[PDB]
Amino acid sequence: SIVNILSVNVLNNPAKFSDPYKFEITFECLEPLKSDLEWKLTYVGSATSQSYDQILDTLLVGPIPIGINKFVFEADPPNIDLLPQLSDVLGVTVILLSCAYEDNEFVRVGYYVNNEMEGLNLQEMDDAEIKKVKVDISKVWRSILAEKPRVTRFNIQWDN
């Protein structure tokens, strides 16, 4: 792995469910790459079913000079109408930040994201009582657990 992510820093935390995600991402690269880095953020809408994944945004970053570089990835919030249920926004959910070179994924950082609603004590409620909640999305805030990323790395064939 010729590209190493050094830090990802979430610039706006906590934020409204509906605010754009802003990540300042610093990476190191040894050789100057021919192509862009294709980054992407993915909201995981159902823990069980991949078909509720929302690709929130993507971003090409380039050209890539040797050394340590950073950039801000501003991505759109999830679309509330694509969730299986509205109440699924609450509690812990996941986002996956990833990067690909020439349409091949080389790293993926997963974040747990905690979501709470104004005036609602979520820790007492059991899963049945949670769904009955009348979710007002304009009153849901997130905090990304940026300090505890789960990194997965993939071997790809770079500019060889």
- Residue 105 burial class via C-beta count within 10 angstroms: exposed 0-12, middle 13-18, buried 19 and up: middle
The least distance separating a copy of itself from the CB of residue 52, rounded to whole angstroms, comes to 5
* 42/93 with CB nearer another protein: 93
* 6/82 with CB nearer another protein: 6
* Residues of the shown chain interacting with another protein in the complex, contacts defined by CB under 8 A: 5-10, 26-27, 36, 47, 57-65, 67-72, 91-93, 109, 112, 124, 146-147, 149, 151
Grouping H, G, I as helix, E, B as strand and the rest as coil, residue 79 is coil
Give the separation between CA 22 and CA 10, rounded to whole angstroms. 6
The least distance separating a copy of itself from the CB of residue 75, rounded to whole angstroms, comes to 15
The least distance separating another protein from the CB of residue 111, rounded to whole angstroms, comes to 10
Question: Could you tell me the sign of the dihedral formed by the alpha carbons of 34, 42, 50, 54, in that order?
Answer: negative
* 67/159 with CB nearer another protein: 67
Residue 101 tokens, joined = 């070179």
